[PDB]
Nucleic acid binder design. Sequence first.
DNA 1: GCGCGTACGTGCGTTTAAGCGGTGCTAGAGCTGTCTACGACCAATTGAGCGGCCTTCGGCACCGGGATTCTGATGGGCGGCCGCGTAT
Length: 95
Amino acid sequence: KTRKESYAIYVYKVLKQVHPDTGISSKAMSIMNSFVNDVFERIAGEASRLAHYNKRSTITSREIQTAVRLLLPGELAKHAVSEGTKAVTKYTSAK
DNA sequence: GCGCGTACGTGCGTTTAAGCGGTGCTAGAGCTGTCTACGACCAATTGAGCGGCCTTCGGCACCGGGATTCTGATGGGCGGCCGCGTAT
């Protein structure tokens, strides 16, 4: 049949996590995927840009790390890094 | 439109610090050179994800049955009708 994949499974549990027996319209659901896919290119594209400025050829986590910092304002940014840094840190701990 | 008020432009003198070209020093960019770890690629197996399809309980707002309260015809008894009516 057709494809047209989306992030619907990811957005839904997140909302469950923050009000479990709280609801949503089928119109705000796409707004959400539209919103995510939009932020996706915003961050990953910028990573691509720096990589081939100061003369290197792969994109790691550090770059995102840097990228994120100047893409967003002071207070959210730090918490965001923190969360980000740990999630992965744990990831490696396992293996 | 008009009129009041005052603040901001234009000037001079005083004053303060940029810009100039002079030297010295070393830090940090840029180059360079070897290793090897981590990502792309190709393979084969496996279940997360998408289309397709129809689920069940709880909550908003309309509802249900039974005792109880208020309105209506009924009725004997004390009074009043003054006006037609029979008896001597």
